[PDB]
């Protein structure tokens, strides 16, 4: 389709090693209809902050909203002081600065709000940005690297809009149970955009930034995707796939071939997740149109990308159980509202504000559930046995290794560095290590990244 894919600005440090982000309301147009939206350095979404491993930057964050917000760097291994969870309040009109010393490998991470009880609304209203972490190793690989030509961020999100055009967000009994999801699919903000890519290798940095909707990327003509990276960065070698399931807040980088003059789309396939299979997501849905052009691209697909550390021996490692639950009365009413609204289509494949839980407790921001060890591998066992909802479980402060994802060894493209693991009626195990500290006043969060679950209790705080 006609409008070109918007390309987030690649924001680097200035002469004082500073970067400025302004958080503001603005306006966007979706299918001819204007809507109030929120953005970083803009009306909608945000820039791609570019960082170099081992080099420090100060970020000056200005809240130009009229409500409180927080700024979290999802995927970044930083102290709890700069991590920007629910306790990282930036008052409206106020300025807060954080020093980040990046000490992890090349990876596409991202940033987004983490306001207590309202994170779902603030992301839905428009707030997300990328983080391009670079190191010495990755630049040696000669991957596609022309930002916005053959190296393009692709941030995919759904939205629901009112008859008047305004984003129609609500945290109610239905969305607390099944999540906020919509009928309009957005790609860097645009409805079904087009991208001119040169012949050879196209590098796509995929981010699922939907609140609650899982995706599954493929191509319309079924040309393969070569996955080169996960949440925490480079896989050891490429993993070649026909389709790519992505959970809320997960990133993958893929190279895809642009070989003839023939256009093709990037698409998302229907998922079996409650609520998410209603038309138009009952069939393959286009994400963006790739349009070959002949201009110069020398990007490469290496045989060998990186070498990752080995999984540690499990013996002696501390084990932490995290039992995710939902009040069954939220479950019921939730699925009933869903049934009322949409009907049988919804199934293709009491304060509800504290109804979602971990270890029998809705998130309390004052009482960290535990102190985790520093610089020592632990094994966390996260169970969703007891309900049928999807829970992409996420841990701040870390890139971990999945030992077991929902009852099975992880797929090859998911066995490298991840910050999210799937939990859905089964149990997952991960090998977590924290290299930085987080006091109780600025605790790390562990939580479901189905944002409406997070906002109604499915989060805990922990210290290091």
Interface with Cu ion (CB under 5 A): 74, 391, 396, 448, 450, 453
d(CA 286, CA 263): 13
Is residue 100 within 8 Å of 82, Cβ to Cβ? yes
Shortest Å distance, C-beta 80 to Cu ion: 12
* Beta-carbon count within 10 A of 341 CB: 12
Shortest Å distance, C-beta 43 to Cu ion: 24
Shortest Å distance, C-beta 173 to Cu ion: 15
Shortest Å distance, C-beta 448 to Cu ion: 3
Q: 413: annotated binding-site residue?
A: no
Label residue 459 exposed, middle or buried (CB < 10 Å: 0-12, 13-18, 19+): buried
Residue nearest Cu ion, CB atom distance: 448
Compare residues 74 and 414 and give the one whose CB is closer to Cu ion: 74
Compare residues 84 and 410 and give the one whose CB is closer to Cu ion: 84
Compare residues 246 and 448 and give the one whose CB is closer to Cu ion: 448
Q: 353: annotated binding-site residue?
A: no
Compare residues 205 and 391 and give the one whose CB is closer to Cu ion: 391
Give the CA distances from residue 217 to residues 20, 67, 147, 244, 266, in Å, rounded to whole numbers and listed in that order.
33, 35, 21, 5, 7
Shortest Å distance, C-beta 390 to Cu ion: 7
| Cβ-Cβ contacts under 8 Å for 193 (sequence gap 6 or more) | 1, 3, 4, 5, 6, 187, 288, 289
d(CA 342, CA 80): 42
Shortest Å distance, C-beta 96 to Cu ion: 18
Q: How many helices (H) and strands (E) does the chain have?
A: 5, 31
Shortest Å distance, C-beta 444 to Cu ion: 9
Which secondary structure element, helix H or strand E, spans residue 341, and what is its range?
helix 328-342
* Beta-carbon count within 10 A of 426 CB: 14
Compare residues 8 and 249 and give the one whose CB is closer to Cu ion: 249
* Parallel/antiparallel/unpaired status of strands 129-134 and 48-52: parallel
Compare residues 141 and 346 and give the one whose CB is closer to Cu ion: 346
Compare residues 124 and 450 and give the one whose CB is closer to Cu ion: 450
- Find the distance separating the first CA and the last CA of the chain, reported in whole Å: 49
Strand partners, 200: 258
d(CA 244, CA 142): 24
d(CA 287, CA 244): 13
Compare residues 202 and 450 and give the one whose CB is closer to Cu ion: 450
Shortest Å distance, C-beta 369 to Cu ion: 17
Q: 453: annotated binding-site residue?
A: yes
Sign of CA dihedral 386, 432, 462, 320: positive
Q: 112: annotated binding-site residue?
A: yes
Q: 448: annotated binding-site residue?
A: yes
Question: Residues at the annotated binding site?
Answer: 72, 74, 112, 114, 391, 394, 396, 447-449, 453
Question: Residues at the annotated binding site for Cu cation?
Answer: 72, 74, 112, 114, 391, 394, 396, 447-449, 453
């Amino acid at each position: 389709e006609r409008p070109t894919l918007p390309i987030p600005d690649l924001l680097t440090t200035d002469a004082r090693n500073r970067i400025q982000l302004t958080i503001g309301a603005g306006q966007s147009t979706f299918g001819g209809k204007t809507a109030t939206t929120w953005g970083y350095n803009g009306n909608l979404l945000g820039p791609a902050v570019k960082l170099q491993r081992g080099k420090a930057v100060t970020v000056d964050i200005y809240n130009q909203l009229t409500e409180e917000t927080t700024l979290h760097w999802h995927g970044l291994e930083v102290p709890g002081e700069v991590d920007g969870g629910p306790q990282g309040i930036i008052p409206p009109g106020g300025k807060r600065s954080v020093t980040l010393n990046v000490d992890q490998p090349a990876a596409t991470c991202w940033f987004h709000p983490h306001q207590h009880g309202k994170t779902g609304r603030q992301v839905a209203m428009g707030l997300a940005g990328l983080v391009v972490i670079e190191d010495d190793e990755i630049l040696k690989l000669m991957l596609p690297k022309q930002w916005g030509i053959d190296d393009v961020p692709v941030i995919v999100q759904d939205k629901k809009f009112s008859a008047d055009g305004q984003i129609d967000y609500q945290l109610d009994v239905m969305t607390a149970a099944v999540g906020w999801f919509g009928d309009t699919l957005l790609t860097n903000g645009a409805i079904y955009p087009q991208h001119a890519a040169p012949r050879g290798w196209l590098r796509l940095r995929l981010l699922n930034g939907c609140n609650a909707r899982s995706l599954n990327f493929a191509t319309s003509d079924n040309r393969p995707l070569y996955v080169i990276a996960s949440d925490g960065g480079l896989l050891p070698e490429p993993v070649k796939v026909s389709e790519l399931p992505v959970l809320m807040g997960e990133r993958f980088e893929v190279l895809v071939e642009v070989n003839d003059n023939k256009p093709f789309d990037l698409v998302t396939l229907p998922v079996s997740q409650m609520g998410m299979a209603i038309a138009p997501f009952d069939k393959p849905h286009p994400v963006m149109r790739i349009q070959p052009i002949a201009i110069s691209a020398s990007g490469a697909l290496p045989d060998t990308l990186s070498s990752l550390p080995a999984l540690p021996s499990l013996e002696g490692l501390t084990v932490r159980k995290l039992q995710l639950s939902m009040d069954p009365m939220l479950d019921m009413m939730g699925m009933q509202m869903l049934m009322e609204k949409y009907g049988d289509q919804a199934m293709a494949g009491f304060d509800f504000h504290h109804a979602n839980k971990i270890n029998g407790q809705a998130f309390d921001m004052n009482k960290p559930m535990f102190a985790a060890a520093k610089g020592q591998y632990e094994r966390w066992v996260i169970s969703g046995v007891g309900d049928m909802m999807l829970h992409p479980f996420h841990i701040h402060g870390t890139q971990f290794r999945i030992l077991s994802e929902n009852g099975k060894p992880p797929a090859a493209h998911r066995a490298g560095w991840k910050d999210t693991v799937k939990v859905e009626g089964n149990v997952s195990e991960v090998l977590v290590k924290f290299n930085h500290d987080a006091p109780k006043e600025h605790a790390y969060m562990a939580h479901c990244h189905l944002l409406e679950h997070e906002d109604t209790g499915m989060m805990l705080g922990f210290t290091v």
